[PDB]
């Protein structure tokens, strides 16, 4: 019972916004989202550029 409570309930009551907690939270929460935004946005923008320039092959891509 103590293990389950400590691993679920007791966390927030015994949490204090601290420099480590705040910085780690920022990095591991929002960091990955912006990395994946950068990646996907760049890829999509390149694809759109190629499509606009008519320089992409979709000869049989008829099922999106």
């Amino acid at each position: 019972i103590r293990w389950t409570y400590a691993r679920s309930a007791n966390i927030y009551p015994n949490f204090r916004p601290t420099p480590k907690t705040s910085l780690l939270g920022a990095l591991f929460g929002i960091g990955p989202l912006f990395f994946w935004y950068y990646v996907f946005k760049t890829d999509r923008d390149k694809k759109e550029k190629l499509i606009q320039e008519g320089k992409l092959d979709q000869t049989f891509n008829i099922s999106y």
């Binding site: 409570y5 007791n10 009551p13 015994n14």
Partner: peptide, 29 residues
């Protein structure tokens, strides 16, 4: 109930009480 986990112990009495709650020696805890 006192058996449930509580805040970080600061006074030595709190450390002894935590050790008793977790069934550990005070030195080990």
């Amino acid at each position: 109930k006192d058996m449930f986990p509580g805040p970080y112990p600061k006074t030595p009495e709190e450390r002894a009480a935590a050790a008793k709650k977790y069934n550990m020696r005070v030195e080990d805890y």
